[PDB]
Amino acid sequence: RTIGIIGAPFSKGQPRGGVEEGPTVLRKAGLLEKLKEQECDVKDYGDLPFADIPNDSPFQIVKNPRSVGKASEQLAGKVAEVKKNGRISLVLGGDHSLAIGSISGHARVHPDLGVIWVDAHTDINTPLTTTSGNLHGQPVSFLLKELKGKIPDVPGFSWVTPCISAKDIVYIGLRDVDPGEHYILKTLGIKYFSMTEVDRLGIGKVMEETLSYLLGRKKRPIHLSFDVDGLDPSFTPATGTPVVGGLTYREGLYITEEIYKTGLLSGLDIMEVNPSLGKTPEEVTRTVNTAVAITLACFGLAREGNHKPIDYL
Amino acid sequence: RTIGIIGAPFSKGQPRGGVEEGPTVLRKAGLLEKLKEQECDVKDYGDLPFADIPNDSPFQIVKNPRSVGKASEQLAGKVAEVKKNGRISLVLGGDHSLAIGSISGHARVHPDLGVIWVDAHTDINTPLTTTSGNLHGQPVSFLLKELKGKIPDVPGFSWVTPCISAKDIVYIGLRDVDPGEHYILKTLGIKYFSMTEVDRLGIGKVMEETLSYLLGRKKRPIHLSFDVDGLDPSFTPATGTPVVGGLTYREGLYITEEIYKTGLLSGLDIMEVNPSLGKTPEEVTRTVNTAVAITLACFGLAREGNHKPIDYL
Amino acid sequence: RTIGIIGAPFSKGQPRGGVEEGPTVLRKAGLLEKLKEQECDVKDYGDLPFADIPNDSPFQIVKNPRSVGKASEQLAGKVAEVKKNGRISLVLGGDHSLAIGSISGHARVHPDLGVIWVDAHTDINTPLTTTSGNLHGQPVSFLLKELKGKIPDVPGFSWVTPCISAKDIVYIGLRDVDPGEHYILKTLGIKYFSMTEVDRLGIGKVMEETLSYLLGRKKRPIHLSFDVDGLDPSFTPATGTPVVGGLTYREGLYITEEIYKTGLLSGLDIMEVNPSLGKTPEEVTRTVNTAVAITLACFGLAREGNHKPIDYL
Ligand SMILES: [Mn+2]
Ligand SMILES: [Mn+2]
Ligand SMILES: [Mn+2]
Ligand SMILES: [Mn+2]
Ligand SMILES: [Mn+2]
Ligand SMILES: [Mn+2]
C-alpha cells in the first residue's frame, strides 16, 4: 500500500471556515510520520494552493460555485497524476465538495472504480433540490451518470463529467437525509446502509455485504470518501454538521480495517474536520486523533497487532 | 398513523416531583409541530387536570394510592375516547404508574392488544412485594390476569380490571429487577429481553423475536409503554431511576422505527422524563431531545430518510 | 460459587504506584458485603503483606524483577491454599504482573485449567522483547510452555514453572499489541478475539466460541484474568494503560455473566485499577464501581434479575 498525500485546504463548499485548516492540523498529529512507522511509501504532494476567486456570486441558490468548481478541477488533476504514479491518493481536505474533484481525478485513470461513502448524509442534493445551497452537500449529484441532464450548468463545473453510476456506490452511516435525496436514493436504486441497517445487521455483516456488492462480479479499484461527521460526534465533535446516533469509534475502525484487507483501496478522502469548531482544545485533539486512526487503519494498522516478516524470538 | 396526544402531568407514582412537568417541556421542544412536519394528523387533547386528593394516607406500604388510582382511572377513560376517535393515543406523562390507566383505557376498545414494555425495570411489583411502596414500580402488577387474586384491594383501584395475560407482553431493556419480580417473571412465563439478551442477540434479532412473539399467531393492536430510563442515562439523564448499562440512542431508535413499520402501533407512552432531575440545563435538553426523537420514530421519521409520494426531480 | 478473597497490593509490575491501593478501595465499595448479599460464602484472606526488596536493580531491561518475582511466588502459594480449601480465588491486586503468581498457584491444584484473558493488551512480552521493561506486560510470557527456553533466567523467578500451553488460553479485548507479541500470537497459534473480532462477530458469538474452544473437548476449571483496561476508559478511566476503542460496560458484564453460567469459574483476577490515576473523584468511583459490578457478575448477579428458591407470592 503506497500512498500519495494531497493537501486540499478548501472550505467554500459550506459556510464555516476552519475546515481549510484540516490539512494543517492533521499533519501536526504526525500522520506522515505514523504512516511511515508502518509498511508504506509516503510521498507528500503538499497543500494545493487554492486560488481566490473574488467575483463569485451565487448561482440561483448555489454558493461560491466557481470557487468550489475550480477547487475540484484543480484537485482532480492532482489525484490523476498521483494515481498515474501508482499511488493511493490521500485527500486531506476541508469540506466534502472537493469529493467531486477526487472521484473525478481518480476515475480518469480508473473508470471501473467503486465508491464507499461513509457519511451521516448522502450529499446527493442537486443544485435544484438543495435548500442550503452549500455544495459540500451536492458532490454526489455531479458524479452520477443517471443524474445526467438533471444537474444544470453551474459556473465552474463545465469540466465535470459524471464518472459513476448509481450502482458503483454504497453509503454507510446515513442518519440525516433530505426528502429529495431520499427520492433519488430509492428512485436510482442506490445501495446503502444507514444507521438503521447498521443497528439491525451489525457492522460486521454491513461490511460483508458492502464489499460483496461492489466486488461481487469482479474486483475493481476502490475509493473511500470518509466524512468525519459519519462517526458519532462524541468521537469527532469538531465538524460542521454533527448528527447524534452515529458510528462508533470501533465501527469506524472496523470499516477501514476491512477496506484495507481487500488490498483494493485506491483513493481515500478524510473530510469535514474543522478544528475551529471544537468547543475545547480536547474536542479538537479528539476529532483529529480519531481522523488519524481512521487513516492508519486504511493503510495497515490493525487492532490485533502488526509485525514485519521476521523472526521476533 | 393518526395520533391523539394526552397530557398526563402526574408524579405521585414515585417520590421526586418534577416528572409532572414532562407534558410541558416536551411540548416546548416542539413535538406537536414536528409530528405535523410529518405524515400525521395531530390532535391535542391537552394536559389532563389531575385533581388533588389531600387525604390519601399510605395503604400499608403503598404510597398515594387514591391519587395514583384516580389519575389512571381518569387517563383510562381519556385513552378510550381517543381510541374511539380512531387515533393512536400518545400519553406524555410523569411517572410510570399512569401506565395502568393507559393499558386499561386502550384495551377497553381493543381487548386483543399486545404490550412491548421498554424499561430498565419490570415494574411488576405487587402491593405485597414492593419494598419502596412507589406505585410507578407496580403498574404491570395490576394489569396481568394471572396476578388476579394476588393484588389486594387498594384504595383508588376498585375500578381496575386486569386486561392482559402474561403472554401479551414483552419486556425490552431490563437491568434492575427485584427478587419477587424475577420470580413472577419466570413463574408466569413472561417473555423478555434484558440487556443480556440484547448483548447476546443484537437489537436486530431482539426486535425480530419480540414482534414475532406478539404478532406470530395473528396481527393485533400494539401498545408501547416507553420508560425513558430504558435508555442509558448518558442519553436520558433527567429521570428518577437511572441504571447504567442501558440501551443506546441508536437501539432506542431502532426499536420504535421497527414498531412503526408494523403499522400496528395503537398506543404509546413516553414516561419518566423529569427535567428538575437534570444536573445541567444540557442534561435536560438532552433527555427531552431524545424523548422527542423516540416519539417521532414511533410515527414515521426514519434515519435513512423520508419523502412524500411525489417526483422530486 | 464459593469465593476466596486475596488482597494483592502490588505495583512494581509497572511505574505508577497507586495500583497497590486497589485491594483497599474495592473493599470500601463494599465488595465483600455485596458478594454476601448474594448466594456465596465469602472468606477474606486479607491483604498479602508484600515485603520490601531494597536491593533490586534492573535485569538488563526488566524492572524490579526480584520484587515482582517474589510477589507472585507469595501469591501463588496463597491461591493454592485457597483452591485447596475448595474456593474460587479472587485476586484483587495492583498491576497485572501478579497474574504470574495467580495462574501458577491456581494450576498447582488444577493442571487442566483454562485461561480467558480480558485485556487491551496481550501482556505476552518476554524479558527479551519488552521495550518498557515493565513486568505487568510480560506475565503471560512466563506461564506458556512453548515459550520455555525463550524466557531467560530473571532474578526472582527461578520458582517459576510454565503451567499453560498456547491453546489453554483465549484473549478477549485486544487493541494495543506490540510487534513481537503479535509474532508470538500467530506463531504459537494463540486463540484470540481482539476488538476487531468483537466488532465483526458480536460479543455474543465471541463468548460462544471462546467457551466452546476451551470447553469443547472436556470441561475444566477456568481462570479469568481481568485487566480493567480491557473496558473502554470511559468506563474504567483510573488505570495506568488506557486505550480507546474498548469493551463496553454491557459487553464487560456479558462476558462474566456467561463465564459464571458455565459453573466452571475457579480463579478470577481484577487488575490494574489505580485510584490515584483518576482525574476526578468521580472517575475513581466510576472505575471502582465498574470493577465491582464485573466481579458480582462473576459470582451470580444477573441483569435479568435474581431470586432464591422460594415462593415470592
Ligand atoms: Mn459529507
Ligand atoms: Mn456528513
Ligand atoms: Mn418504568
Ligand atoms: Mn424504569
Ligand atoms: Mn494487563
Ligand atoms: Mn491492559
Q: Could you give the number of structural domains in chain A?
A: 1
Distance CA C96, CA C90 (A): 14
Distance CA B67, CA B53 (A): 6
Alpha carbon distances (Å) from B267 to A6, B98, B116, C153? 55, 13, 10, 72
For residue C249, the domain's CATH number is 3.40.800.10
Using an 8 Å Cβ cutoff, are B228 and B287 in contact?
A: yes
Distance CA C99, CA C144 (A): 12
Using an 8 Å Cβ cutoff, are C197 and C206 in contact?
A: yes
Using an 8 Å Cβ cutoff, are B220 and B198 in contact?
A: no
Which of B204, B302, B312 has the CB atom closest to A199's CB atom?
A: B204
Residues of B classed as catalytic? 96, 119, 121, 123, 136, 227, 229, 272
Nearest partner of A103 among A65, A138, A75, A64, judged by Cα: A75
Residues of A classed as catalytic? 96, 119, 121, 123, 136, 227, 229, 272
**B12 alpha carbon, distance to own chain's centre:** 16
Kindly identify which residue of chain B lies nearest to residue C308, measuring between CA atoms: B179
Residue where the block lists cell 435508555: B231
- As a whole number of Å, the end-to-end CA separation of chain A is 27
Q: CA torsion C74→C78→C79→C81, rounded to 10°?
A: 140
Side chain identity, residue A270:
I
Q: Does A131 touch chain B (CB under 8 A)?
A: no
Distance CA C23, CA A12 (A): 57
Q: What is the interface size between B and C, counted as CB pairs within 8 Å?
A: 71
- As a whole number of Å, the end-to-end CA separation of chain C is 27
Nearest partner of B257 among A199, A134, C161, judged by Cα: A199
Q: Are strands A114-118 and A222-227 parallel, antiparallel or unpaired?
A: parallel
Distance CA A53, CA A65 (A): 10
Per-residue DSSP letter, A211: H
Sign, CA dihedral A16-A20-A26-A28, equals negative
CA of A174 to the centre of ligand 1 (A): 10
Subunit contact A194:B254, Cβ cutoff 8 A: no
Binding-face residues of A in 207-236 toward C, CB within 8 A: 207
Compute φ and ψ for C117, nearest 5 degrees: -115, 100
Distance CA A13, CA A68 (A): 6
* Binding partners of A (≥3 Cβ pairs within 8 A): B, C
**A285 alpha carbon, distance to own chain's centre:** 20
What are the chain A neighbours of B286 within 8 Å (beta carbons)? none
| All residues at 6 or more sequence positions from A240 whose CB lies less than 8 Å from its CB, including other chains | A14, A15, A16, A19, A95, A229, A272, A274, A277
Alpha carbon distances (Å) from B119 to B123, B146, B297? 8, 21, 17
Q: Is B304 annotated as a binding residue?
A: no
Alpha helices in C122-264 (DSSP H): 139-143, 179-188, 195-215, 249-262
Q: Is B123 annotated as a binding residue?
A: yes
Which of A251, A311, A313 has the CB atom closest to C199's CB atom?
A: A251
**C50-81 burial, b for 16+ CB within 10 Å, e for fewer?**
beebeebeebeebbbbbbbbbbbbbbbbbbbb
- Label residue C279 left, alpha or beta by phi (over 0 means left) and psi (-120 to 50 means alpha): alpha
DSSP C7-51: EE---TTSS--GGGGHHHHHHHTTHHHHHHTTT--EEEEEE----
Alpha carbon distances (Å) from C33 to C48, C260, C290? 20, 19, 16
CA of C247 to the centre of ligand 6 (A): 12
Subunit contact B175:C249, Cβ cutoff 8 A: no
Distance CA C100, CA C109 (A): 15
Subunit contact A304:C178, Cβ cutoff 8 A: no
Cell of B63: 404510597
Alpha carbon distances (Å) from B296 to A7, B39, B228, B270? 41, 11, 14, 11
CA of A229 to the centre of ligand 2 (A): 5
Which residue range is the domain that position B29 belongs to?
A: 1-313
Distance CA B111, CA B104 (A): 9
| All residues at 6 or more sequence positions from A69 whose CB lies less than 8 Å from its CB, including other chains | A154, A155, A156, A157, A159, A160
Q: Is C96 annotated as a binding residue?
A: yes
Distance CA A104, CA A160 (A): 8
Distance CA C34, CA C3 (A): 12
Using an 8 Å Cβ cutoff, are A145 and A164 in contact?
A: yes
Nearest partner of C233 among A286, A109, A291, A198, judged by Cα: A286
Distance CA B194, CA B198 (A): 6
Q: C201 in helix, strand or coil?
A: helix
Distance CA A65, CA A292 (A): 30
Distance CA C106, CA C82 (A): 9
Binding-face residues of C in 90-129 toward A, CB within 8 A: 122, 126, 129
Distance CA C237, CA C280 (A): 10
Distance CA A215, CA C150 (A): 44
Side chain identity, residue A3:
I
Side chain identity, residue C56:
D
CA of B192 to the centre of ligand 3 (A): 15
CA angle A130, A136, A139 (to 5 degrees): 80
Distance CA C30, CA C35 (A): 9
- Alpha-carbon Rg for chain A, nearest whole angstrom, is 18
**B137 alpha carbon, distance to own chain's centre:** 12
Strand partners, B265: B222
Binding-face residues of C in 280-309 toward A, CB within 8 A: none
Using an 8 Å Cβ cutoff, are C75 and C102 in contact?
A: yes
CA angle B123, B124, B126 (to 5 degrees): 120
Side chain identity, residue B241:
T
Using an 8 Å Cβ cutoff, are A16 and A229 in contact?
A: no
Sign, CA dihedral B61-B67-B73-B77, equals negative
Per-residue DSSP letter, C120: S
Using an 8 Å Cβ cutoff, are B93 and B23 in contact?
A: yes
| All residues at 6 or more sequence positions from C131 whose CB lies less than 8 Å from its CB, including other chains | C61, C178
Q: Are strands B169-174 and B114-118 parallel, antiparallel or unpaired?
A: parallel
Distance CA A191, CA A108 (A): 24
Distance CA B122, CA B174 (A): 7
What are the chain C neighbours of B197 within 8 Å (beta carbons)? 304
* Burial category of B72 from C-beta neighbours within 10 Å (exposed 0-12, middle 13-18, buried 19 and up): buried
Distance CA B196, CA A218 (A): 41
Which of A250, A305, A307 has the CB atom closest to C245's CB atom?
A: A250
- As a whole number of Å, the end-to-end CA separation of chain B is 27
Resolution (A): 2.0
Per-residue DSSP letter, C144: B
C-alpha distance from A221 to closest chain C C-alpha (Å): 24
3-state secondary structure chain B: CCEEEEEECCCCCCCCCHHHHHHHHHHHCCHHHHHHCCCCCEEEEEECCCCCCCCCCCECCECCHHHHHHHHHHHHHHHHHHHHCCCEEEEEECCHHHHHHHHHHHHHHCCCCEEEEECCCCCCCCCCCCCCCCHHHCHHHHHECCCCCCCCCCCCCCCCCCCECCCCEEEEEECCCCHHHHHHHHHHCCEEEEHHHHHHHHHHHHHHHHHHHHHCCCCCCEEEEEEHHHECCCCCCCCCCCCCCCECHHHHHHHHHHHHHHCCEEEEEEECCCHHHCCCHHHHHHHHHHHHHHHHHHCCCCCCCCCCCCCCC
What are the chain C neighbours of A308 within 8 Å (beta carbons)? 179
Cell of C84: 485447596
What are the chain C neighbours of B151 within 8 Å (beta carbons)? none
Using an 8 Å Cβ cutoff, are B105 and B77 in contact?
A: yes
C-alpha distance from B172 to closest chain C C-alpha (Å): 10
Compute φ and ψ for B268, nearest 5 degrees: -140, 135
